[PDB]
């Protein structure tokens, strides 16, 4: 029914690796050679044309053929009574069950290298209990666990883009009707190598939304594959020599339903970086573009990503970049919202933004005279002054979030760029009050900004304390 | 005639045929329509009292990779219930080993034998059944046993049905009433001759004149 | 991984044709380099083609806009998807002007080259709003070689100079935005007018001015620009008329508005004990993710099938 855990060791450039598994599984990441072994291993244990042949001296780790290779699986029959792959299972197996462990399964394999002969031989087990497995039993050349799965390996190598598409189709409706029988699962590495764009979204839906690809194992460089993700785990490669593995069971919940397709789309190309700066809109990007094309123009080459975050709460990127194993940094400003229907009540937006990613939730709501009499400037300065009460009410809260690479502004990010360079704004806002002014326009006047910036500038905006998220995303 | 409208059926089955009507025949026929047809992972079991008649089926019907057992009812339990799952349902010092003069008239005794001599035990009396009993007895016990038994087989072919005893169709009815798996009878009423092994002519009868599940065909040829 | 080696094998060649050819006249053939490359190593490997003199003549295919945001004084040439082999090419630069933001024009632009038609917008408030529009009505406006392109806060020119020139056809959906000058009050400048304009070789408008008595402030000074917004609309008929044959579409106010006159009822609905347009235009980006969230198949046909939309069928084809 569903697949659950594997452990690989002394295999490769594999020690000790246990990771966690779903029916559709996505790998990615640096390494590019232990994203190519976890295949390997899998065709070793489940491929009866590649467990053929034996293993190698250099299959061992560390060339050291005294040691013995384990490859383990594990599954999950809780859903005998639903589905019927559980049932192709049971029926090929027959007394390696007991009935106190009705509900996991086993296949593992074992080599031992023999030095006369310089030879690695396999051999396969099967049971319930981890401690107590036996030989799968077979005559000839054939083995009892070669009549349920069917193991299909698609690559690209070993317009033309229509033709790959033309072999997914005839894929998969080849391995419907002939393979009615066995359980059918497929190794799709780097579909992506002479694919056009849309050609990508396309072969994503079909892969995220048709039922002929129950069960999987997905290797791709492309975020374009990943726009229509959904029910997945993703397995990320950490970018070192030893092998290490993060996972992570993504799922978009139904509130985030109206906004799939922004949610996609943005953490697709975050999910191939170190770290990432979580920010609101395009302003900030602008300005810190600029920023740091004038002192870090490499931060991209060695892994930093600005991520627009927009009018969501945060949880459901952390959640899969912390799982995942990235580092993420989030700025934010207090905000005030209005509600919906009363008047004179306002909601700790950005306070309550902060707190839904410390576990505690929600605060408490605000009330502000605000006569009618005033309006405009002296509005916004109230509001300002209540900002700052606000800010300063909550200072171990504050202190906390800073914990947690969390920056939150007293205000607003006009009034921390002003408080880094306001003789460079009062010079190019003439003749007004440069946060008043830059606030009318938000795109225009920081392209104005952004155009009369010099490196002086760019590196007291970069050296204030103020700033410091940004000094997170350069590794400092 | 009518060996047209049961190539045609599928479920519950009766064949009411007499002495040199063909059941051979329209028992492999049945089978063969049965496996092309159905292109699941499901197979089927034949049963049947002697070895030479296994043998002519296994011969007629062919080769294949899918597994299909064509043998006697004494050999389906013990290749499929007893052997594989007796220590799920008894415990762990209960032997899977047997090579089968060690009679006797008791059950427990039976459970003794094969426990401590490690030999299939047997009864004296021909009227009870010490294999077709510890059968069912081990069904009831183990759910990896029946879950077995469900996933493998799709439908089960009987013969010669008037020669079973009590306990045989006790096993054969819990398999189509608890399990859900369809049967195929073919016996003549008038064959009870062998009487003289506790056959029991009874239970085809009230099968034939009682059971609404079944269809009932009769062959004059 | 194994984009190391690849990095390692193009800096032998770069330091290797040099040394030994020093007496001929080299020329680099790269096809599709990003095979099974990094998207880091893609990005360093568009900043060597583009900012060092190894590479002075080079011919390169590609399939991924990673390598072109460095893009910068060269030729694109792009092969129409048909049968017949047809190609465009385009001289690219970038303007002086245009050189604190290069880095936003060249990512914006790089996956814009790889569709068929664009549709230019501005943030992305219309961003959500039209997505979650097409994926109710048109799902698969992206197979079929469909693109959302925000613009920002510059003008139309290069991106329009760049798609027209390869073929590709582009969209734009603007609205009417009064600019106060910087410094002297009481003078704006006619900015969607003057954007529109630029785009058809008439170029820039004369200012105008509005009293706005002091004592007036918050909504009623809205609609007393909106009510100027109305009346420059009105006089400029003509010209909107032109816009409209070059696939320009002005709005006469804002997007709210012409949302309203299409979802009024349901906007009232949703937004309960409010003025639908004022509580829309207080928080754009919550409130527009409040509407969506709330809107039906209906609201989407009947946003679809309006003539204030008729963008949204340009970009899918009608």
Known sequence: MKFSNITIKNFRNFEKVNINLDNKNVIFGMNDIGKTNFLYALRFLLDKEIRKFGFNKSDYHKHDTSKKIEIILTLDLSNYEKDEDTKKLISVVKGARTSANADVFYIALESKYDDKELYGNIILKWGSELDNLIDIPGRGNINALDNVFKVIYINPLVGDGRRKMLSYSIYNYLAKKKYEDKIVIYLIEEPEISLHRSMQIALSKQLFEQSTYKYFFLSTHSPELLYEMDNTRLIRVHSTEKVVCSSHMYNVEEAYGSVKKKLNKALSSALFAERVLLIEGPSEKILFEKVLDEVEPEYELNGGFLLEVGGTYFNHYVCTLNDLGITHIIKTDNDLKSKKGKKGVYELLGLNRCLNLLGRENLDEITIDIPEDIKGKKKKERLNERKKEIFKQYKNEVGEFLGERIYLSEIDLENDLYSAIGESMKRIFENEDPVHYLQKSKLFNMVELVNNLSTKDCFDVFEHEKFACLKELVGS | ?221
């Open chain 2, 1 to 221: 005639m009518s060996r047209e409208q049961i190539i045609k059926d599928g479920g519950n089955i009766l064949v009411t045929a007499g002495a040199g009507s063909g059941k051979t025949t329209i028992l492999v026929s049945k089978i063969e329509a049965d496996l092309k047809e159905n292109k699941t992972h499901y197979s089927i079991a034949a049963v049947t009292f002697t070895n030479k008649a296994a043998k002519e089926i296994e011969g007629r019907l062919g080769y294949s990779s899918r597994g299909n057992f064509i043998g006697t009812n004494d050999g389906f339990v013990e290749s499929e219930i007893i052997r594989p799952f007796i220590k799920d349902a008894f415990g762990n010092d209960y032997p899977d080993n047997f090579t089968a003069d060690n009679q006797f008239a008791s059950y427990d005794k039976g459970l003794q034998v094969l426990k401590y001599q490690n030999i299939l035990g047997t009864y004296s009396n021909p009227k009870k059944n010490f294999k077709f009993q510890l059968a069912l007895d081990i069904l009831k016990k183990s759910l990896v046993a029946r879950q077995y038994i469900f996933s493998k087989y799709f439908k089960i072919f009987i013969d010669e049905y008037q020669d079973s005893d009590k306990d045989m169709h006790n096993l054969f009815m819990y398999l189509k009433d608890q399990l859900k798996i369809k049967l195929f009878i073919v016996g003549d009423p008038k064959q009870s001759i062998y009487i003289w092994r506790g056959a029991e002519p009874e239970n085809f009868n009230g099968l034939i004149e009682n059971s609404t599940d079944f269809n009932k065909y009769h062959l004059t040829s």
